[PDB]
């Protein structure tokens, strides 16, 4: 249908420029105010601004001076560049479709941007051997998020990925577990695919009993 997808760095150092792009599909590009909205962790929604394909643009006055919005009609993309970020700019950033009159009706999935001086670290993945529950422990990574799928997305039935814990080390760990029929523990293979886009690390780990 109309599909909007964000893309950009997941970790940005203080004082640098956050840059994010949204690719639009399933809609005309020229009749909408292409929007960015952000939501800081545990806080409400904050409008950032919009851009129309002609270049008409407006932005939130409290971010005046830091926002540049870019449109690229040939790619059906639009971008946000937010300069001089501080920790305060850590948030989920959504690109969205504003109908001009009618509200913001289609939202992307959101991309989490963490602004930090700490370096990325990809996860160590350990198997959690076994209905039986089996899983993967995705240990000590930074920043969030990590994506975990099972059997390259083939297994969705009974998968539960838990919220990560922020440990005293400053690093995160999470666990993903899938509940399986006991008959299968030998006949079926269970692979967790862990993708940590901030450190560009993908790990595949087979879990055996």
């Amino acid at each position: 249908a109309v599909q909007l997808e964000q893309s950009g760095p997941g970790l940005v150092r203080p004082s640098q420029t956050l840059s994010l792009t949204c690719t639009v599909s399933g809609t005309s590009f020229d009749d909408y105010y292409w929007t960015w909205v952000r939501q800081p962790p545990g806080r409400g929604l904050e409008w950032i601004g919009y851009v129309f394909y002609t270049g008409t643009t407006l932005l939130d006055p409290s971010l005046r001076g830091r926002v540049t919005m870019l449109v690229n009609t040939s790619k059906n993309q639009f971008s946000l560049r937010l300069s001089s970020v501080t920790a305060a700019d850590t948030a989920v950033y959504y690109c969205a479709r504003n109908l001009i009159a009618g509200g913001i009706d289609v939202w992307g999935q959101g991309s989490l941007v963490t602004v930090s001086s700490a370096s990325t670290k990809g996860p160590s993945v350990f198997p959690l051997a076994p209905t039986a529950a089996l899983g993967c422990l995705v240990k000590d990574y930074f920043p969030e998020p990590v994506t975990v799928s099972w059997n390259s997305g083939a297994l969705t039935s009974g998968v539960h990925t838990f919220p990560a814990v922020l440990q005293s080390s400053g690093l995160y760990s999470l666990s993903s577990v899938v509940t399986v029929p006991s008959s299968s523990l030998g006949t079926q293979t269970y692979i967790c695919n862990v993708n940590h886009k901030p450190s560009n690390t993908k790990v595949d780990k087979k879990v055996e009993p």
Partner: protein, 204 residues
């Protein structure tokens, strides 16, 4: 509340009517601008609410304030609700209202405990993983025992967070050295919820 003001929290019983107000000023709602409403369920993007031929959701507006009314309140209406309006071409959001549906049944937690993998013990480290799910209401106490004595050090427990199904999930991790793990007959993850304990034990 942000430039528009909303109650932080509203609650109602199933079947009841609840109201969520959104107060702005002469520059925005009081200036002949429309008020839009978004529903944001746990871990998802906001959804714009549509009031046409909507049997349960309706809006009111007078002066500088607007209101969302929900009738025949159901547990799947639990969500954060945001109002939004306009000040010229600026879009302005309210600060959000958490709607809670009352009188929902207590659900006791399912607890799964995993021993350290042999692989991790090769790394000279050991993590015991206690996964706690499907409980309601959202507070639990998690305690760890090494045989019968309490373990305080090395414990990291998350704050419970609400799942799509409206119940909560939490995790507790215990970090041990391989020698501490091998030197006890059992380790238990003890989870107490609304006064009942569920305990799970593992042994080297």
């Amino acid at each position: 509340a942000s430039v528009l003001t909303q109650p932080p929290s509203v609650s109602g019983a199933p079947g009841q009517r609840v109201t969520i107000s959104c107060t702005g000023s002469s520059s925005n709602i009081g200036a002949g601008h429309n008020v839009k409403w978004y529903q944001q369920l746990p871990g998802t993007a906001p959804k714009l609410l549509i009031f046409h031929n909507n049997a349960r959701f309706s809006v009111s507006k007078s002066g500088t304030s607007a209101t969302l009314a929900i009738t025949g309140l159901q547990a799947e209406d639990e969500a954060d609700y945001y109002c939004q309006s306009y000040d010229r071409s600026l879009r302005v959001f309210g600060g959000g209202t958490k709607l809670t549906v009352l009188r929902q049944p207590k659900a006791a937690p399912s607890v799964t405990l995993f021993p350290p993998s042999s692989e991790e013990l090769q790394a000279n480290k050991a993590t015991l993983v206690c996964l706690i799910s499907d409980f309601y209401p959202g507070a639990v106490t998690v305690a760890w025992k090494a045989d019968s004595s309490p373990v305080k050090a090395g414990v990291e427990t998350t704050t419970p967070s609400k799942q799509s199904n409206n119940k909560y999930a939490a995790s507790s991790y215990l970090s041990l050295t391989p020698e501490q793990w091998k030197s006890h007959k059992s380790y238990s993850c003890q989870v107490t919820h609304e006064g009942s304990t569920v305990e799970k034990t593992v042994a080297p």
